[PDB]
Amino acid sequence: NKNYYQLPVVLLWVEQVTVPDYLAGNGVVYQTSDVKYVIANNNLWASPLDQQLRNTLVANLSTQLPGWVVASQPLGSAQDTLNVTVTEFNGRYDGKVIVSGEWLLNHQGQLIKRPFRLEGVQTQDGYDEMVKVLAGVWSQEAASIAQEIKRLP
């Protein structure tokens, strides 16, 4: 059978999330060696990964930022903007999942650029658990971004 996977979806405009080509295909990515990434043929994203990363980012930030309106749509001219590149979002042969990239926040004219690289541990086999753990780590990255925002005026 074919299986499809979704990162669960639980002023600030999350303008865009970019992924490179190898993460932009239909299949979920598994790193089988130190050099090789494989796109699954029968275990696919239920919608393109950059869209899922963007939507889950909006929802996770919304739960992390009470008093804020976080959206994937423009909200107002004075809004903060958040642009994210995700360069790694995959499982790995050693049971780990890797989530890394860089975000760029424009908060009232201040540009804040922060790299991120986080790891999770897959306690069960299968693409089910891999996607679960990746979603959890992505939510941790949203919490980190919201913590930086709450330290701003």
Numbering used by the authors: 22 to 31, 45 to 187
Q: What are the paper's exact sentences on this?
A:
The E. coli Paraquat Inducible (Pqi) Pathway is a putative Gram-negative phospholipid transport system. PqiC is predicted to anchor within the periplasmic face of the OM and comprises an ABC auxiliary lipoprotein domain (formerly DUF330).
After TEV cleavage of the N-terminal hexa-histidine tag, the sequence of PqiC17-187 differed from the native processed PqiC lipoprotein only by the removal of the N-terminally acylated Cysteine (C16). We therefore propose PqiC17-187 to purify as a monomeric species in contrast to the octameric oligomer of PqiC, implying multimerisation is dependent upon the N-terminal lipidated moiety. Two of these chains, chains A and B, sit in orientations similar to those of the two corresponding chains in the native PqiC asymmetric unit, however, the third chain, Chain C, sits perpendicular and slightly below the plane of the other two, interfacing with the bottom corner of chain A. Despite this global geometry change, the monomers from each structure align strongly yielding an RMSD of 0.568 Å across 151 pruned atom pairs and 0.591 Å across all 152 pairs. Whilst the density corresponding to the first residues of the β1-β2 loop region (residues 27–31) is more clearly resolved than in the full length PqiC structure, the electron density for the extremity of the loop (residues 32–44) was mostly absent from the 2mFo – DFc map contoured at 1 sigma preventing modelling of this region. Despite this, the electron density corresponding with the core of the protein was a considerable improvement over that of the full length PqiC structure with side chain information clearly defined in both β-sheet and α-helical regions. Overall, our PqiC17-187 structure provided us with high-resolution side chain information throughout PqiC, with the exception of the β1-β2 loop region, confirming the conformation of key residues of interest lining the octameric pore.
